[PDB]
Amino acid sequence: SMDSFKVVLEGPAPWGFRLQGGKDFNVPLSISRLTPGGKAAQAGVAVGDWVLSIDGENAGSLTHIEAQNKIRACGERLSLGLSRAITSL
Numbered sequence: 001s002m003d004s005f006k007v008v009l010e011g012p013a014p015w016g017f018r019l020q021g022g023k024d025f026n027v028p029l030s031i032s033r034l035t036p037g038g039k040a041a042q043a044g045v046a047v048g049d050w051v052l053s054i055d056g057e058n059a060g061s062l063t064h065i066e067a068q069n070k071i072r073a074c075g076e077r078l079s080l081g082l083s084r085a086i087t088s089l
Contacts, residue, residue: 001085001088002050004081004083005044005082006081007044008077008078009040011077011078016039016042017031017034017041018034019032019067019068023060028060029067030050051067051082053080054067059081
């Protein structure tokens with residue numbers, strides 16, 4: 001199970017994260033690395049969060065590079081729809 005949420009980052013870049021995955025890798029796009037103290041980390045993003053949407057575009061329809069372009073070409077703000085595993089122990 002996973003918990004969905006949204007954050008909006010305020011520019012300029014850099015936003016402070018790296019991606020992994022995408023439709024060309026047969027898996028959801030996710031956050032693989034976060035810059036400590038960077039904008040994404042300060043907004044409450046965590047490594048391993050799935051990326052559901054980028055500026056309204058459904059991330060499940062994007063290749064890895066298409067997702068990177070959507071971020072790089074996003075202008076002043078970056079809206080991310082995310083989901084986080086509920087790691088029930």
